[PDB]
Design a protein around this nucleic acid. Sequence first.
DNA 1: CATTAGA
DNA 2: TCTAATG
Length: 327
Amino acid sequence: ETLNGGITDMLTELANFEKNVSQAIHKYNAYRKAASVIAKYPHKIKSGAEAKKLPGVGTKIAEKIDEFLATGKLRKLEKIRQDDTSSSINFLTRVSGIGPSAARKFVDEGIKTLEDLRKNEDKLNHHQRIGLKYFGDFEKRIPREEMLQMQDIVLNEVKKVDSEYIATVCGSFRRGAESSGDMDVLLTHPSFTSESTKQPKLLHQVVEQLQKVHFITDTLSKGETKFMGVCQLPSKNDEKEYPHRRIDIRLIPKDQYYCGVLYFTGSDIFNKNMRAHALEKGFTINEYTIRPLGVTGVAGEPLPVDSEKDIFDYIQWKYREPKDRSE
DNA sequence: CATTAGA
DNA sequence: TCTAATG
Ligand code: NA
Ligand code: NI
Ligand code: NI
């Protein structure tokens, strides 16, 4: 957590680069397990040789570790940091819609910057285009103050359309966060579950709703179970307009809400820990359900859930307010 | 880890 | 169809 920092950080710096600027899936894959295991080791790596005893640690990384340890740097680490092409790749990546593949592609073309990106707006797809348009807002944080306003509106229309609608704004927001990065909206309806062969319109209704009243302004990707867009708060009585903010709505079988609800609510660790618990308590938890464990090794049979409580009761745990779902 | 776009 | 990119 801190005695192997410099090792874990450089190593990750190492991993990410092969992953991105290079196409070395394995190397990359190599750098991460080590940085993973060099992470769990309870003592101060004092030498490569020392490290080396590790699993996944070979001659290459170890050699590396000696250099880092000896001198407070790595050349391999310094050259790349310096490298313009590689730089650029990391940057271009920042364009929502922009992935390593395309970032590499734009580069060879000579598209390095932001401006280079604009000047060839033609070269981008919708997504990337959108992203291009809202790069500054895109990167900005979401004050809960606003998260407050946002949610308001959204349950509003949701309701408006059909009163049978269940919207919940999940994630860090849900957990009290003073700030967020995009809103996540969990959506369900009775009239939609596990079997009941869809009702794409269900999602459909609501997205339309939001646009209709101007909350929704763009479309990043619209599917029959997963929308992904952008949004904006009606810029007041002037002098102050709201920054474009990402958005995502998702339909779900009413019979698997809460797990997902629970799940998407985190925290990652809260989840992981609770789930870990369910295991002892003879259960299995995941994003869509809750099945009791059969000694045979495993088992199935999704237990009925009506609320965040049910899952709790099941694994006979203390109800934890989302506030305190931190871990 | 699944959904969407896209070519 | 596969491959990319988001979450
Ligand atoms: Na990106
Ligand atoms: Ni368009
Ligand atoms: Ni979200």
